[PDB]
């Protein structure tokens, strides 16, 4: 299952600002994903997963 490209628009470029304003909840999903990745990275760095993964083998 590849990252399928957008269909051919016959020289109409992908205006990301217009389609981003067309789907305004995507910015809310983006900031929620940023907060989730921030909290998960804070959980990961506290757990020393890479540290105990690299000190063993």
């Amino acid at each position: 299952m590849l990252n399928d490209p957008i269909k051919s628009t016959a020289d109409v470029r992908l205006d990301k600002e217009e389609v981003l304003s067309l789907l305004p909840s995507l910015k809310e999903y983006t900031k929620k994903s940023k907060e989730l990745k921030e909290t998960m990275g804070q959980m990961i760095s506290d757990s020393h997963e890479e540290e105990i993964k690299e000190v063993f083998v």
């Binding site: 269909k7 051919s8 628009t9 016959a10």
Partner: protein, 59 residues
């Protein structure tokens, strides 16, 4: 005489039928999809977003 009158009027009608078929096309048929001409003729009774997407990129 009526046969010759009809033949002359058919010869006059030939140039008119060639001119009124060679007008501005105004985006004519046999160029759109099925759903575009079905929305032109009205009451399609079967909507399908995938065919609308695949036909709106063909205009």
């Amino acid at each position: 005489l009526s046969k010759e009158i009809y033949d002359n009027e058919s010869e006059l009608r030939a140039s008119q039928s060639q001119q009124i078929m060679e007008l501005v096309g105004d985006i004519p048929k046999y160029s759109l999809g099925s759903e575009l001409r079905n929305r032109v003729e009205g009451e399609p009774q079967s909507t399908s977003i995938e065919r609308l997407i695949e036909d709106v990129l063909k205009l």
